[PDB]
Amino acid sequence: GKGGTYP
Amino acid sequence: AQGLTQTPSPVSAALGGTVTINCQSSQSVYGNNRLAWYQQKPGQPPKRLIYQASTLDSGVPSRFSGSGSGTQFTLTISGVQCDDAATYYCQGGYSSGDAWAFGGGTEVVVKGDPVAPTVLIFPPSADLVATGTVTIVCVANKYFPDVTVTWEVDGTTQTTGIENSKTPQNSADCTYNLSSTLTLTSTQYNSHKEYTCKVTQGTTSVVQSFNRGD
Amino acid sequence: QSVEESGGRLVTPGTPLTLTCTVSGFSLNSNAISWVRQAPGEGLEWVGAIYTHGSTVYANWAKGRFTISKTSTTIELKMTSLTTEDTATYFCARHGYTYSFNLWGPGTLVTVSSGQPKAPSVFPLAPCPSSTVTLGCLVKGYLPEPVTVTWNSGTLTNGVRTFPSVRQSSGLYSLSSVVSVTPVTCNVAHPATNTKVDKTVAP
Numbered sequence: 001g002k003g004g005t006y007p
Numbered sequence: 008a009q010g011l012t013q014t015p016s017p018v019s020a021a022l023g024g025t026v027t028i029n030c031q032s033s034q035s036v037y038g039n040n041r042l043a044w045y046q047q048k049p050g051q052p053p054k055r056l057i058y059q060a061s062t063l064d065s066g067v068p069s070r071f072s073g074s075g076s077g078t079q080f081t082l083t084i085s086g087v088q089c090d091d092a093a094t095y096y097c098q099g100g101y102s103s104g105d106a107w108a109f110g111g112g113t114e115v116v117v118k119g120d121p122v123a124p125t126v127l128i129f130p131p132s133a134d135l136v137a138t139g140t141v142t143i144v145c146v147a148n149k150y151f152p153d154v155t156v157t158w159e160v161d162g163t164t165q166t167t168g169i170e171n172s173k174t175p176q177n178s179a180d181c182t183y184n185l186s187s188t189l190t191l192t193s194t195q196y197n198s199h200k201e202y203t204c205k206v207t208q209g210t211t212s213v214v215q216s217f218n219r220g221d
Numbered sequence: 222q223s224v225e226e227s228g229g230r231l232v233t234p235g236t237p238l239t240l241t242c243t244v245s246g247f248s249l250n251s252n253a254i255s256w257v258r259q260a261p262g263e264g265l266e267w268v269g270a271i272y273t274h275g276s277t278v279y280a281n282w283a284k285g286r287f288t289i290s291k292t293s294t295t296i297e298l299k300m301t302s303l304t305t306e307d308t309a310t311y312f313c314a315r316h317g318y319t320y321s322f323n324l325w326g327p328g329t330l331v332t333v334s335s336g337q338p339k340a341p342s343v344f345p346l347a348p349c350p351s352s353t354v355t356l357g358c359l360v361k362g363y364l365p366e367p368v369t370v371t372w373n374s375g376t377l378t379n380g381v382r383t384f385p386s387v388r389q390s391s392g393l394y395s396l397s398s399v400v401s402v403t404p405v406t407c408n409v410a411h412p413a414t415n416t417k418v419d420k421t422v423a424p
Contacts, residue, residue, distance in 0.1 A: 001273030004252035005317035007058060007167065008281055014392070041319030049385070052312060052325035053265060059319050095339040096265055100320030106278050107255060107320075127399070129346035135359070142359055144346055144397050148382065160283050172384040172396065186384040186397050217349040 008104030009034040013097060014167040016114035022181060028113045030075070030097030034104065039076045041100035046093045047112075049175050053096065084115070091177035092117045119181025124150035126206045128215040131196065141196035145204030145215065147185040150179070152208065158185040159203040165189060189206065222246035222324065224254070224313045229364040230413065231338055234304050240329055242296040242313030247274070252316030252359060253316035254296045258309040259328070270316070271296055303333045332365035336392045339364045340416035343409050346399060347424050356397035356422040358407035362391075370398035370410045 010033040020026050028044075036042045040060040045053035055064045057073035060080060070085045084091050097110040124147040131141045147154050158165035168191055174184040187204060196219065203216040227304050228240040249271075256268035269279035271289045278285060288299040296313060314322035339362055346357030360368050364381060372382050383398040398407055409418040 001276070002253050002270065002316060003320065004316045004323065005247065005318070006252075006315075006323050007062075007317045007319045011287055036380065041320040045321065045322075047265075052327060054324075054325075055321060055323060058321040058323075062319075064323075094264075098265075098321060105267065105280050106270065107267040108280075109257075109267060110298065112264045127348070129357060129359075130349050132344045132347075135344040138342075142344075142395070144357065144359060145355055146357075146382070146397075147400055148355075148399075161234070170387040170395075174382060174384060184384070185384040188387070188395070189399070190389070221349050 009099070009101055011097060011099060011108050011110040013110040014113045016112070017116045018113055019116045019118060021118045022120070023075060023086050024090065026087050026091070026115055028082040028095050028115075030041075030080040032078045032099050034101060035077045036099040037102050042073075042075070042080045043098045044073055044082045045096045045098065047096065048093050054077040068198050070090070085116055087115070089117050089119055089176060090178045091115055092178070092181065113205075115201050117176060117181050119151050122149055122151050122180070122182055123208060123211055124148060124154055124213060126204060126213040126215045128202065128204045128217055130202070130217050130219070135195060136193050139193045141191045141193050141204055143189040143191075145187040145189075145206070147183075147187070147206045147213075149182040149184060150178075150208060151182050153183065154185060154206050154208045156185070157203070157205040157207065158187070158189050159205070160199045161201050178190050224315060224324055224326045226311055226326040226329035227312055227326055229293070229311065229331050231332045231334060233353060236303060237299065237301050238303070238331065239312050240298040240331070241415055242298075242301075242326065244294060244296070244315075246310050247315065249291050249293060249296070254291070255314045255316065255322060256287070256298045257312045257314055258323075259312070260309045264318065268298065268302050268311070300331070303331070305333050307331060307333045309395055330366060334364070334392060336364050339393060340414045341409055341418060343407065343418045345420060345422040346397060349421060350424065351403055353403050354424050355399050355401050356405055356424065358409065358420050358422065359395070359397050360409050361395040362393045363411055364393050365413050366394055367412070368394075368396065369410045370396075372398070372400050373406055374408060376413040377402065377405065
C-alpha cells in the first residue's frame with residue numbers, strides 16, 4: 001500500500 | 008542511508024540549445040527504473056516531468072527525455088526554451104534504506120537574446136521618511152545578461168546598506184529584473200543631497216539620480 | 222483531485238506544531254501520502270510517508286522529530302524540537318503506482334524564529350512626465366513570510382514585477398512590486414495576520 005491508483 | 012547526486016549548478020545553454028542533467032544513486036533504484044524527474048520554479052510546487060526513468064508525464068513537451076537505469080540516469084532538454092529555466096530534481100524509489108529520496112537539484116540557466124536594462128530610481132515617500140527609516144529603491148528592468156549595481160551618495164561610492172533582489176528568468180524572453188535598495192536612517196537621508204544608482208552590463212552603464220526634495 | 226497543506230506559522234524554537242494536508246477526490250485507503258520539506262533556496266527533502274494501512278516510514282535524517290498520522294480526509298505532520306534550521310515550506314504529495322509523486326499542494330511555511338508577527342507597511346514608489354510611468358509599492362516590516370502583491374484587484378497584470386523578499390537585521394521582511402501604466406492601487410495580503418492593505422500610488 002505504498003503506491004496509489006494513478007501513475 | 009543511500010545517496011543521490013546530480014550535475015552541478017548552473018547548467019547553461021543558449022535558447023534553442025541542448026541541456027544534459029545527470030543523476031547518480033549509490034544504490035540501484037527499485038526495479039532499476041523507479042526514477043522520476045521534477046521541474047520547479049521559485050515559489051511553485053514541483054511538477055513531475057518523467058516517471059519510471061523514461062515515461063513523459065501528461066502534457067510534458069517532447070523536448071524532455073529521461074533515460075538510464077540502475078544507478079545512472081539522464082534528463083535531456085533539446086531546443087531549450089526560456090520557460091525551461093528552472094531547478095530539476097531526480098527522485099528514486101528504493102526497496103532498502105530511505106524508501107524515497109531526492110537528488111539535490113540542478114539549476115538550468117537559458118541564455119536568451121541580450122537586452123540592455125532600463126533603470127528607475129524611487130525616492131522615499133514623505134510618510135516613509137516620517138517613520139525615521141528610509142528605503143531608496145533602484146530597479147533594473149527586463150535585461151540579459153546579468154548586471155552589477157553601484158550606488159553613490161553625494162558622489163561617494165556607497166557599498167554598505169544595499170540589498171539586491173533578482174526575479175527568476177522571464178518564462179517568455181529569459182530576461183531578469185532586479186531591485187537594489189539602499190536603507191538609511193531618516194537622519195542619514197536628510198544629511199545628504201544626491202542619491203545615484205548605476206547599473207552596469209558588460210561595458211555599458213545606465214545611471215539614475217535624484218536630489219532629496221526635488 | 223487535489224491536496225492542500227495548512228498550519229504553517231511563526232513559532233519560537235522548541236514549540237511543537239501540527240501541519241494538515243486536506244485531500245479532495247481520492248481515497249487515503251488506496252493512495253499513500255508523503256511530506257516533503259524545502260528550506261528557502263534549498264532542495265526537496267523527503268520527510269516520510271503514511272501507506273494505505275496506516276504504516277509510517279521516515280527519512281534517516283528525521284531522527285524521530287516528525288510524526289505522520291491520518292484520518293479519512295486529512296494527514297497530519299507533528300513536528301518537535303524545532304530550531305531556526307527547521308524554517309521551511311512543507312508539501313504533501315500523493316504517491317503514484319510508479320513510486321513517484323503525482324500530486325502536490327502549494328506548500329505551507331513553518332517559520333522558526335524569535336520575533337512576533339507583524340503586518341506589512343506599504344509605501345508608494347513614484348519618480349521624483351510621459352503618458353506611461355512605472356509606479357510601485359514598497360512592502361516592509363512584515364513577519365512571517367509571505368505577502369502577495371496584486372494591482373487594481375488583479376485587473377492590472379501586464380509587466381508587474383514583484384521582487385523576492387529580503388530579511389533586514391530586525392528579522393522583518395521587505396519587497397517591492399512595480400508596474401508600468403497609462404489611478405493604480407497595489408493590494409498587499411499578509412495571510413499570517415489576515416491583513417489586507419491597499420495603497421493608491423499618485424504620480
